[PDB]
Structures are given as structure tokens and as C-alpha cells.
Amino acid sequence: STGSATTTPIDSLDDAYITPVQIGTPAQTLNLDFDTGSSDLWVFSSETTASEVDGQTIYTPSKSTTAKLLSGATWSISYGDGSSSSGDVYTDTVSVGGLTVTGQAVESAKKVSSSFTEDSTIDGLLGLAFSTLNTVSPTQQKTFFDNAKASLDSPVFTADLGYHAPGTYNFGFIDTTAYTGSITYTAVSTKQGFWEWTSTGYAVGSGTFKSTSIDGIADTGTTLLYLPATVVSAYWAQVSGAKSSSSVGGYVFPCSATLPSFTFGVGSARIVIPGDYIDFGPISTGSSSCFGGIQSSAGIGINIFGDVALKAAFVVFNGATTPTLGFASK
């Protein structure tokens, strides 16, 4: 089997991408944030505290003929941005792009933090990191990808995010029309449960490539590119007037600037992030200070190749017995 679904930016900045997901019988379609950096599938629901719902579409398990309470199971997640959600668990039929999993754990939120309430476009998350990070207790649950894997034509999914445009998530096949040149594969450690790999270095604009090992996670759930402070300083030093602002919480730059590209290594291959991808616009409406799309990972504990980096590539998440990542230019 295979599946193919379009993923769409939630706003003009590509702050997050949503993908339609069918849950239950008859189908209830929710727009979920696919997250290669976490391993829970959780939704706004008929159980979510009413004051914490503001415009999201909710899953109502009592309207699904295939929904079953997973008796005794609860979940609770705390994200790095300080947001959180928690609740109970149903099993139900879940389909993504025509690929159907029966018996998927659907984590129904009873509580969500303010960042989730305030984002009316995101009805929940769908996790695609390894199932070892799933938060369901007392019986950990599998991700949609892990449940689908045995049925798939190939044990892979691919992320092809757009810059200010829709893109695609495919399951079970590699669309050889969706990239240019060849795919470079690189090793993945599952030791922390993330898709964790090691970039071979970087360049800023037309500068020389610096060979240096950079360990991080391929995370579709993350908007920006988080790298070591040395690398980030080297990038922003090439932008007149850029500075790190403790008031704003990262690097900002004059909205009049033209940003240089950023290149990251994948083995002997190179992925080039165009400068425009690194512009996240005014810090507040009407400001002439703009927020940078490359930020320091100092205080995170890990480098994050988020959407700014991933959207410059066709990315293969190879879930074979020995997992690997693949990157191609596009």
C-alpha cells in the first residue's frame, strides 16, 4: 500500500504545515501537524475543555462506529516551547492520503495549553519519530507510520515541504519525479527516539564550505533551523545590522536586508537554503525588524533541522530495520 497527502502552510510565513487526516467511521477529517520529532497522534476532541477550543475541528469518538476506548490509557506531553496537552486514548481507523491503519491510537485531548488553543488552524499532531517517544501510559502506543510499515510497499515516508506553497507527504514509495539529481542517504541514531543524523558542515552564502560534524534531528514539527552558536553567528555576521536580541528571543535583522543562502552538508552532498527561506518577517506588525530563520540551539541541548532546512530538500525517512535519512535537492 501507499499514501500521498498534500501539506499546506498555515500562514504566509510557513509557521507550520497541516495535512488532512481521516479519523473514524464515517470519516472525520482533521488537519494535523505532521511531526517527525515526536511520536504521539493527538487531537482536539469532544472531551477537550470547552474554554480551550477556539475554532479547531474536533474528533468526536461517540460518532465513530469504529472508535473504542483504550481503557485505562492516558497521555501527557510537554514540548520544548513550553506548550502541553493531555488526555485519554481511543483506537480508531486513521487514513492519510488513501493509506488506512486500523486500530491506531488516537489520543483525545482533555486539556491543551494556550499556544494550541490560539492556533485555530491546527486540530492536533501526528507523530512520525520512533514509537519509543510515545507518551501513552501504561501501554506505550505505536505511531501511524510504525502501524502502517508492514503494509507499505517500502518502509519509508517522504517529506516534500513547500516554500510559501503546499507540499507533499508520501508513505510507502519514493516519487522519483519530486527531486533533482540523486538522494544522498546518511546514518540515523534512534538512541534518543528522534530521526538524529550528522551533517558534514555548512557554508554561508558564496563562502567556503566548513567541514564540521553537526548532530541534530530532522523535525518537521519545528519551524526554524537551530544550529550551534558558532555557526549561527557566522551566518548573521554576513547581514548588516543583524543582532541577537534578548528582548525578542533570537536573531533579528533589518527587513531591508537581502539574506545570504545557507548550505548544509549531507555526506559529500550539499543542500542550499535560499536566503528568502530564512526571512520570517516583521517581529510585530509594521516593524522594520525581521525575525531570522536560523537561530542558536544553545539551551535546547540538540540541533534541530526544522522546516527552514527541510523545505529546501526532498527528504526520505527510511524506516527499514536500520533506519536512514535521505536528502535530495529539488
Ligand X SMILES: O=C(CCC1CCCC1)N1CCNCC1
Residues forming contacts to ligand X in the complex (CB under 6 A) are 15-16, 35, 37-38, 77, 79-81, 115, 133, 135, 219, 221-224, 300
Q: Which is nearer to ligand X, 77 or 328 (CB)?
A: 77
Q: Which is nearer to ligand X, 81 or 175 (CB)?
A: 81
In whole angstroms, the minimum distance from the beta carbon of 295 to ligand X comes to 8
DSSP string, 194-218: S-EEEEEEEEETTSPPEEEEEEEEE
Q: Closest by alpha carbon to 129, among 79, 178, 183?
A: 79
Q: Which is nearer to ligand X, 45 or 222 (CB)?
A: 222
Report the residue closest to ligand X, judged by CB: 80
In whole angstroms, the minimum distance from the beta carbon of 73 to ligand X comes to 16
Q: Which is nearer to ligand X, 255 or 300 (CB)?
A: 300
Alpha helices in 189-317, H assignment, sequence order: 229-236, 307-310
Q: Which is nearer to ligand X, 178 or 300 (CB)?
A: 300
In whole angstroms, the minimum distance from the beta carbon of 157 to ligand X comes to 16
33 is catalytic: no
Burial class (CB in 10 A: 0-12, 13-18, 19+), 134: buried
In whole angstroms, the minimum distance from the beta carbon of 148 to ligand X comes to 20
Q: Which is nearer to ligand X, 92 or 196 (CB)?
A: 196
Look up residue 119 and give its amino acid. Answer: D
Phi, psi of 270 (to 5 degrees): -135, 135
199 is catalytic: yes
- The C-alpha atoms of residue 4 and residue 168 are separated, in whole angstroms, by 7
- The C-alpha atoms of residue 44 and residue 111 are separated, in whole angstroms, by 9
Look up residue 251 and give its amino acid. Answer: Y
All three cell numbers of 226, joined, read 537551530
CA distances to 2, 242, 262, 323, 324 from 320, in Å: 16, 43, 30, 5, 8
Which of these is catalytic: 199, 261, 296, 297? 199
All three cell numbers of 203, joined, read 557554508
Under 8 Å between Cβ of 314 and 328: yes
**Which residues 6+ apart lie within 8 Å of 137 measured at CB?**
73, 74, 75
DSSP string, 40-57: -EEE-BTTS-GGG-SS--
In whole angstroms, the minimum distance from the beta carbon of 224 to ligand X comes to 6
Which of these is catalytic: 33, 35, 119, 146? 35
In whole angstroms, the minimum distance from the beta carbon of 10 to ligand X comes to 9
Q: Which positions are annotated as active-site residues? A: 35, 199
